[PDB]
Amino acid sequence: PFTADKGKCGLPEIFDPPEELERKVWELARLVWQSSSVVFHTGAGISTASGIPDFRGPHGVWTMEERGLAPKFDTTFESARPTQTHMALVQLERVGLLRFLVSQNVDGLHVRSGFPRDKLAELHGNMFVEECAKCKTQYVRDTVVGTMGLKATGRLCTVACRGELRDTILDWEDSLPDRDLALADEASRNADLSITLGTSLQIRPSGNLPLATKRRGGRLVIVNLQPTKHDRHADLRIHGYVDEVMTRLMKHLGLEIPAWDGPRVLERALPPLPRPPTPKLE
Ligand SMILES: Nc1ncnc2c1ncn2[C@@H]1O[C@H](COP(=O)(O)OP(=O)(O)OC[C@H]2O[C@H](O)[C@H](O)[C@@H]2O)[C@@H](O)[C@H]1O
Ligand SMILES: O=c1c(O[C@@H]2O[C@H](CO)[C@@H](O)[C@H](O)[C@H]2O)c(-c2ccc(O)c(O)c2)oc2cc(O)cc(O)c12
Ligand SMILES: [Zn+2]
């Protein structure tokens, strides 16, 4: 916990040159078009362009700590806006091109983006979510729940119960929420395409779920500025900013990135919207 293993921190960044970057995003489009069941895996790299620092990037939390410096936030969690990548993931779900979303992120931005909570696994918890110890009812607050480590927040359950409410932030030694992990695992095993975005894949078992897509011959795409633990297992590795990658991809797919209305919570995925017809591939 003090000696908690933080993994490989501050590895050099890789940038694919523009011609290679454009060709690999075309190939990502081709894979997304061909796939029956697409699962996306997100880590802290998708929120860096909203001012929230990652863990192991050059100015990540743990990288900075190793060099006796502090991370820098350009936002509060409460004032953080969903990125282009966040909003692209909202649209890809609404048109049926995303089956499921697995996130290691605690920043609350997937939920706040409007992404349906029944297609999301929050493997490490949500800064804004408290849960009733008695009835298990979750509350999605407009401000961060002021405790970490699954502690009493001081609030009681209002279900029609008075149970103690606790944060959902795992400490190092805590095991993952059984529901979120079971659904992530089932989605990842059944996917024929898993796309990782802004995760170094160093944390077990979170970082290993994408590998489960490989069994029964599924494909694995890794989008990341640094090397990741499983780069060897990728069919496609794209070294670029996830916003540049996801906006080119959406343009290839003929989709617009929708407007963010401010913080909104969707419990259940709505019926699928229309999508463009598919290109002839080959
Ligand atoms: N805009 C960007 N575009 C692409 N890659 C990016 C960008 N910004 C950052 N990266 C990359 O994004 C990657 C982010 O990797 P890590 O910092 O390990 O975050 P995790 O989500 O995997 O951390 C998992 C858990 O570990 C913690 O202990 C907590 O418990 C976390 O929940 C880096 O390789 C960056 O190069
Ligand atoms: O709780 C904080 C926080 O959430 C993170 O939850 C993690 C559990 O996956 C713990 O591993 C960390 O210890 C913790 O930094 C984060 C955090 C940092 C970078 C992110 O990309 C992020 O999504 C949150 O930063 C903090 C900085 C502080 O000075 C005080 C804090 O309480 C936090
Ligand atoms: Zn309750």
Amino acid at 255: L
CB-ligand 1 contact for 46 (6 Å cutoff): no
Q: Is 64 in the same domain as 200?
A: yes
Q: What share of the chain is helix, strand, coil (3-state, %, to 5)?
A: 30, 15, 55
The resolution of the experimental structure, rounded to one decimal in Å, is 1.9
Q: Which domain holds residue 209?
A: 17-124+174-269
Helices 242-253, 84-94: inter-axial angle, 10-degree rounding = 30
Distance 85 CA to ligand 1 centre (A): 14
The number of angstroms, rounded, from the C-alpha of 14 to the middle of its chain's C-alpha atoms is 21
Probe target for ligand 1 pocket from 109, 200, 228, 237, with the most ligand atoms within 8 Å of CB:
200
Among 95, 102, 44, 51, which residue's Cα sits nearest to residue 72? 51
Paired tokens of 147: 């405790």
CATH number of the domain enclosing 145: 2.20.28.200
Residues 94 and 133 in one domain: no
- Do 41 and 89 sit in the same domain of this protein? yes
Mutation test residue for ligand 1: of 8, 56, 122, 221, the one with most atoms within 8 Å of CB: 56
Resolved by: X-ray
With 0-12 CB in 10 A as exposed, 13-18 as middle and 19+ as buried, what is 78?
Answer: middle
Is 198 annotated to bind a ligand? Reply is: yes
Domain assignment present for residue 275? The answer is: no
162 and 96, same domain (yes or no): no
Please choose, from the candidates 245, 229, 232, the residue with its C-alpha nearest in 3D space to the C-alpha of residue 197: 245
DSSP summary character for residue 80: P
Residues 140 and 244 in one domain: no
Picking from 111, 141, 173, the residue at the C-terminal end of a domain is 173
Same domain, 92 and 129: no
Return phi, psi of residue 236, to 5°.
-150, 130
Pocket of ligand 2 (CB under 6 A): 44, 47, 52-54, 61, 105-107, 124, 148, 169
Residues 63 and 90 in one domain: yes
Q: Give catalytic status of residue 124 as yes or no.
A: yes
Q: Side-chain half-sphere of 208: how many Cα atoms within 13 Å?
A: 5
Count of domains for the chain: 2
Contact 256, 91 (CB under 8 A): yes
